[PDB]
Amino acid sequence: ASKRALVILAKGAEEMETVIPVDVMRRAGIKVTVAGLAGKDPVQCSRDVVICPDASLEDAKKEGPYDVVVLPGGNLGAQNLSESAAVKEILKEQENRKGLIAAICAGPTALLAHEIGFGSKVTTHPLAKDKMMNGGHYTYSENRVEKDGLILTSRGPGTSFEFALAIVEALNGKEVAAQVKAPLVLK
Amino acid sequence: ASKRALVILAKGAEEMETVIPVDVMRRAGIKVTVAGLAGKDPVQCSRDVVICPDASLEDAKKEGPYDVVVLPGGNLGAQNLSESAAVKEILKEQENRKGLIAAICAGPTALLAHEIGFGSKVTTHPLAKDKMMNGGHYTYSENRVEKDGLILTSRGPGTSFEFALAIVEALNGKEVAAQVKAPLVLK
Numbered sequence: 001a002s003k004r005a006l007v008i009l010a011k012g013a014e015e016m017e018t019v020i021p022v023d024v025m026r027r028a029g030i031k032v033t034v035a036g037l038a039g040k041d042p043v044q045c046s047r048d049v050v051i052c053p054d055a056s057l058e059d060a061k062k063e064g065p066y067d068v069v070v071l072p073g074g075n076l077g078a079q080n081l082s083e084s085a086a087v088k089e090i091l092k093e094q095e096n097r098k099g100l101i102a103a104i105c106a107g108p109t110a111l112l113a114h115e116i117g118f119g120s121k122v123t124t125h126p127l128a129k130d131k132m133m134n135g136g137h138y139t140y141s142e143n144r145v146e147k148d149g150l151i152l153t154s155r156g157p158g159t160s161f162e163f164a165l166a167i168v169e170a171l172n173g174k175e176v177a178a179q180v181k182a183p184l185v186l187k
Numbered sequence: 188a189s190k191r192a193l194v195i196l197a198k199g200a201e202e203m204e205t206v207i208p209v210d211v212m213r214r215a216g217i218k219v220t221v222a223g224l225a226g227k228d229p230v231q232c233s234r235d236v237v238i239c240p241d242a243s244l245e246d247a248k249k250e251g252p253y254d255v256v257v258l259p260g261g262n263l264g265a266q267n268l269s270e271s272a273a274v275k276e277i278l279k280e281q282e283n284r285k286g287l288i289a290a291i292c293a294g295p296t297a298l299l300a301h302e303i304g305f306g307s308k309v310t311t312h313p314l315a316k317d318k319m320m321n322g323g324h325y326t327y328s329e330n331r332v333e334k335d336g337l338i339l340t341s342r343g344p345g346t347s348f349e350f351a352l353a354i355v356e357a358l359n360g361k362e363v364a365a366q367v368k369a370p371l372v373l374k
């Protein structure tokens with residue numbers, strides 16, 4: 001049975017941090033749902049790329065749970081995720097069931113907002129560190145990708161391939177990740 | 188005056204190779220037009236990410252010329268670009284005016300199709316080499332990014348940041364490219 005990923009797409013999401021994981025996960029044979037926070041309508045990302053979601057979050061929630069819940073960054077996207085009671089509910093559920101939660105750049109700050117994964121070692125974008133560390137609820141890491149307990153985090157657009165491949169490894173194993181990686185022409 | 192980029196978006200385009208250059212160029216202050224080959228409607232990319240173009244190609248052509256014309260890859264996207272008389276016209280015009288032409292992965296095969304830049308040193312995805320080299324009209328390179336005469340080429344999703352930053356350097360200079368690069372958290 002194929003693994004399933006939920007990628008939550010909010011206004012102001014970093015479009016690279018959205019598309020790279022979506023695409024790489026699909027290359028891995030993961031069934032990915034790009035779910036619009038606001039509804040079914042197209043989403044204006046941080047650098048004005050407009051992406052049509054596969055479904056509203058409301059509807060995608062009905063088809064859960066998922067093997068991974070993915071939170072892109074972009075400061076304003078992460079802020080929208082942080083303010084959402086629907087996101088809170090999804091993440092709490094995922095945490096309760098011991099499922100993978102993945103977040104990149106400023107995305108991990110939504111974990112703080114929703115009180116998810118306290119005590120975990122995490123990374124963020126350098127510019128998001130102080131926000132993430134308010135209260136000392138996590139242990140900070142400068143690794144490009146970090147993973148502790150349920151929580152997989154990464155730093156920025158430039159770590160998005162590494163982040164995506166870590167998700168692939170967690171869901172489908174090291175061999176599939178390596179097979180997906182090779183045709184990408186990564187460094 | 189800001190530099191201007193035309194990114195031609197066809198069905199089957201590799202969405203990473205589309206979004207990374209769009210986003211990075213916008214970070215550089217370049218005015219980017221994502222132009223839909225088929226018209227104004229949303230475009231289903233290779234891994235099913237759906238992107239709404241800024242304009243149809245028909246309309247974007249009217250606002251040219253541009254400082255760079257960018258051809259994403261994705262085999263089926265590149266094939267659609269290769270078959271298009273409108274693309275032929277745009278590239279011929281850009282070549283005639285000694286403007287930058289940039290293409291990635293299988294994207295450079297559209298240059299072959301349209302007889303653009305013969306004699307240039309080029310790279311492609313490894314799997315697109317034999318197509319690109321049919322007739323020996325170009326000189327092949329294994330560099331991650333290659334640039335010769337008017338023609339800037341690159342290899343794959345994993346070289347997209349390098350490709351984008353090369354475009355930024357060509358248009359806006361080395362210092363802007365470096366400033367845009369730093370916050371990305373590239374290796």
Ligand SMILES: *[C@@]1(=O)C(=O)[N]C2=C([C])[C]=[C][C]=C21
Binds near residue numbers: 017073078125370
């Ligand atoms: C991330 O994409 C993000 O979420 N925030 C941020 C900043 C402030 C700079 C560069 C990259 C990013």
Ligand SMILES: *[C@@]1(=O)C(=O)[N]C2=C([C])[C]=[C][C]=C21
Binds near residue numbers: 184204261262294315
């Ligand atoms: C490129 O994106 C492309 O245009 N073609 C291709 C192939 C065949 C494999 C991996 C990446 C790419």
Ligand SMILES: [Cl-]
Binds near residue numbers: 046074075076
């Ligand atoms: Cl941001």
Ligand SMILES: [Cl-]
Binds near residue numbers: 233261263
């Ligand atoms: Cl392809």
